[PDB]
Amino acid sequence: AFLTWAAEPEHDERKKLGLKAIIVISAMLGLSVYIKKFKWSPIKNRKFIYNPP
Amino acid sequence: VSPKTRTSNLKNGLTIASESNPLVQTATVGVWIDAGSRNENAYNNGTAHFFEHLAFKGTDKRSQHQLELDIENMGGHLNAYTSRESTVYYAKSFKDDVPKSVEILADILQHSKLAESAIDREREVITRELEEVNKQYEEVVFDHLHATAFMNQPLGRTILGPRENIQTITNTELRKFITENYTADRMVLVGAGAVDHDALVELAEKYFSHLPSSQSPVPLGTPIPNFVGSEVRLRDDTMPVAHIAIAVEGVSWTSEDYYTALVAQAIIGNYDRAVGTSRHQGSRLSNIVSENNLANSFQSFSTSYSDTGLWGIYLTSENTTQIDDLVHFTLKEWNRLSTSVSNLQVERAKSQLKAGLLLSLDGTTYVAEDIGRQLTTLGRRVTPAEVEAKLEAVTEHDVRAWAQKTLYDKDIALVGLGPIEGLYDYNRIRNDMSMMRW
Numbered sequence: 186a187f188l189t190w191a192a193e194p195e196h197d198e199r200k201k202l203g204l205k206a207i208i209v210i211s212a213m214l215g216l217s218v219y220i221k222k223f224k225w226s227p228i229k230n231r232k233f234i235y236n237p238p
Numbered sequence: 239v240s241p242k243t244r245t246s247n248l249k250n251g252l253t254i255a256s257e258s259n260p261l262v263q264t265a266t267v268g269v270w271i272d273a274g275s276r277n278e279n280a281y282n283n284g285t286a287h288f289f290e291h292l293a294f295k296g297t298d299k300r301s302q303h304q305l306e307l308d309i310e311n312m313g314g315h316l317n318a319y320t321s322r323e324s325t326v327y328y329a330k331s332f333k334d335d336v337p338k339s340v341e342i343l344a345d346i347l348q349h350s351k352l353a354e355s356a357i358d359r360e361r362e363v364i365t366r367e368l369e370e371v372n373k374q375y376e377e378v379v380f381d382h383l384h385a386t387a388f389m390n391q392p393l394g395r396t397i398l399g400p401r402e403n404i405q406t407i408t409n410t411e412l413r414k415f416i417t418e419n420y421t422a423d424r425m426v427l428v429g430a431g432a433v434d435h436d437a438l439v440e441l442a443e444k445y446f447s448h449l450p451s452s453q454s455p456v457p458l459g460t461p462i463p464n465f466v467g468s469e470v471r472l473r474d475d476t477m478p479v480a481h482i483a484i485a486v487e488g489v490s491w492t493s494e495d496y497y498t499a500l501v502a503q504a505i506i507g508n509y510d511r512a513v514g515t516s517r518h519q520g521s522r523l524s525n526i527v528s529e530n531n532l533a534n535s536f537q538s539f540s541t542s543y544s545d546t547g548l549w550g551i552y553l554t555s556e557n558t559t560q561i562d563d564l565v566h567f568t569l570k571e572w573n574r575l576s577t578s579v580s581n582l583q584v585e586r587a588k589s590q591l592k593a594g595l596l597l598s599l600d601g602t603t604y605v606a607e608d609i610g611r612q613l614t615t616l617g618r619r620v621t622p623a624e625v626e627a628k629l630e631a632v633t634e635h636d637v638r639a640w641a642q643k644t645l646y647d648k649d650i651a652l653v654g655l656g657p658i659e660g661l662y663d664y665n666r667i668r669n670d671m672s673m674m675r676w
Binding site: 227 | 665
């Protein structure tokens with residue numbers, strides 16, 4: 186355990202910052218999905234009527 | 239100061255409204271009806287317009303030919319139009335031919351034959367009208383604008399109605415429509431020009447006394463529309479001119495913001511490259527458009543109905559690679575109604591409107607149309623003094639408050655017709671309804 190710490194002393198801090206990043210990034214991913222779908226809905230919902238000239 | 243509009247009622251509830259002008263020799267008398275296509279359902283849509291055709295096809299007394307002759311002999315003409323909320327039938331004649339014209343109008347409205355043979359004949363005429371409106375680009379654009387803004391609602395329907403209905407309209411449903419809708423409490427007999435009010439009231443007692451009254455008489459101009467932000471693109475690369483309308487939900491006739499919306503509309507104003515003075519107009523949009531050759535024309539509108547309206551602009555342009563600029567600069571001028579307008583623009587627009595509302599009424603037909611419209615939408619003729627006071631009450635800060643709730647960051651209805659490849663998708667147009675800098 187001591188030698189593992191000696192090789193990677195940032196270990197504890199790194200994993201806590203990773204938890205924060207995971208949470209923020211996940212929330213941003215969810216919100217980016219909502220926003221993309223919101224912005225794209227006029228394109229997705231587009232309908233056509235064709236009358237051949 | 240124009241002569242006072244006299245108003246009387248009959249017992250059935252028919253309003254008679256008149257404005258005499260002893261300087262003219264002609265008179266416009268007619269019947270304004272608070273009824274139109276909006277009163278149809280989906281099955282009988284087109285009936286109101288169908289009736290307008292058959293009204294001139296002969297009555298119980300006069301045949302179609304006799305009708306023609308009677309009007310020819312009078313010397314003037316008859317005219318009619320059906321809109322979404324209003325139907326009009328009027329007669330322009332000589333001063334002393336007014337009793338004849340009232341008699342003819344009373345006949346065609348109450349005692350029309352609606353003979354199966356004539357229904358069948360007009361059914362083809364009206365079918366051909368479906369394929370010839372196609373040329374009247376402004377009308378095409380505005381009919382699609384209503385269809386999309388009021389999607390699947392009565393105001394969204396066309397006046398002509400679908401092809402299917404034209405083939406299936408019977409004299410029964412025609413009769414039912416005019417019996418339910420053309421009631422005395424919904425009708426106004428209007429006279430303008432060389433008419434005596436007292437003479438017109440007597441003619442109304444003689445001809446329009448046996449009109450049905452409705453079961454539940456509501457006041458004139460009594461109506462829920464749910465506006466849909468949406469677009470219709472009718473791209474046609476073979477057309478040289480693009481026609482674009484952009485509108486938001488506007489104001490009804492009786493809105494408290496009615497005059498505020500008119501002032502806002504006048505700040506943007508109209509433009510036409512063919513008019514000599516248009517390059518010198520004060521409107522900012524006019525300056526941008528003329529200097530950069532962005533359009534052939536634009537026309538701001540504020541259309542009102544009993545319970546809603548459309549406020550927007552109609553653009554025509556040959557500049558097919560700068561449609562984006564034209565639309566961009568138009569919507570940025572609308573943004574400034576929310577962010578930037580002050581007493582400078584507002585007082586200028588009020589000055590222009592105080593005259594404009596009076597100028598419009600320059601002939602007997604325009605006067606009759608004004609009396610008839612106001613009586614069927616407001617229940618009264620509003621005097622110029624009242625109109626001057628309502629305009630004067632509009633401040634810059636009323637305009638800003640109105641634009642901030644009506645225009646700013648709001649959904650639009652958008653119709654493009656013609657070479658509109660350069661018109662961006664809905665989002666990029668709607669994104670110009672706000673300013674990130676504000």
